[PDB]
């Protein structure tokens, strides 16, 4: 339908945040990662604040500082989505209000793992109505759960400001059903290693962490599959998944940071008392870079 | 084995009230698949044929009729797997003698066999029959989840020529396709035919092709030939039909639609529930909207 926010289509990097040794934000490194994504990966958008290991119990003051820097550095060059969930509802509202005042024009949220569908719906609709901003839902509204039902999607998509969904589990029957039932909503693939089969089911783009270093190939897959070049897209998805297979066996986030540094980006190391990367994983990351990205 | 590519119906079998085979109706279902659905092949003795609900002798009679009626007009695969390896070899030898040129076998289930035992099972059927083998992988029913390196171990056997892939794991599907470009991969999930096709599967084996095989071949061919937009529209229409089939009872609704198409599709094996008035009328509406 013509009412879709079609300008939002494309490849979004789940923005990696670098940290200093003491745990604070490496603001200079963060600006380098933003610039690398915009200028070298050529991403269509940035997805800021997704919950990972190092992201989760960081202070909201540091969450806010990441949001300020990201929109200051990106300006209006790419689309932005700010994830403001994974915290209590009143906390998520004050964060949604803050990023809205900063100028973010689209929110996303996943709920905390405390549950009933009425509580999920109220969580989303509260953020929307208290911030006045647009909202991308998650297909799985918390971690240890499963994808929502088709009629639950309808309850949420009844809200005009709930404009799309990040699809995080690869149920491709449900993905087809959601695409058919809501042609006016955006669907973003959350699974980088399944971008090609998602693209032919009509997803509007993809949100992923590997696009920080593999955004060029990802954009090629998306574009070729939508323009009658499926054989070429499949070969690039094959190459991409050789890289992803190695990234996954070597530790996803620590390997992305190592390859960023091999590309000259001051990405540091994984934060917190999160497990230190090993000498063997350092060497494997170097081999992955030489073979796939150098 | 490139000549085996394409769309295979998992052949349904009509049973009488007492569970015995309705031979007249079985020939009618075969004729409908070959002549009207225009399938490239028949997958005989699979889950869809209620294979695991019937006796060894009843399985043999289904295999006899199917190849007698189909002759060499379409490809034929005979599913001979079982928890009983001695039965699997017996059935595999029997259908090989009948003239079937390719076997399939579900992973042995119920007991928690480890992978070395699963490998012995496949290699034993191949060794004892001399026939080709397609791995039947269906974790939703068996609980057996096979790794990429485990597929590699099985695929070192030159007569294990492919896999019927029913796990909805499209990362694993892409990894198997890349690792084994010389093997056949058949999609087992009719409602995900389009995404599987663009990952390079060689065909599909499905229950809904007994009645929706025309659209299935369209999706497959269009997606391989730079018509993705058209293939998605037909997958969308197909999945409206499949969504109704699933809500109405899969086996009962396919058999009911076959009857609306003039094919005597008989009953399901007990304890499969008999179809209800509500389900009969729903099937009539699916037929009128999607297939008449």
Residue numbers in the entry:
A (entry chain B): -6 to 107, 110 to 289
B (entry chain A): -2 to 289
Could you share sentences copied from the article?
NanA belongs to the class I aldolase family, which is characterized by a triosephosphate isomerase (TIM)-barrel fold and by aldol condensation that proceeds through the formation of a Schiff base intermediate between a conserved lysine residue and the substrate pyruvate. Here, we report 2.32 and 1.76 Å resolution structures of N-acetylneuraminate lyase from F. nucleatum in two forms: ligand-free and with ligand bound as a pyruvate Schiff base.
The two monomers that were identified appear to form a tetramer with a similar monomer arrangement to those in sialic acid aldolases from other species. The structure has 0.17% Ramachandran outliers. All residues were modelled into electron density, except for Tyr108 and Lys109 of chain B in ligand-bound FnNanA with a pyruvate Schiff base and the residues at the N-termini of all monomers. The carboxylate group of the pyruvate makes hydrogen bonds to the backbone N atom of Ser44 and to the hydroxyl group of Thr45. Tyr133 lies almost parallel to the Schiff base intermediate and is engaged in hydrogen bonding for the Schiff base reaction.
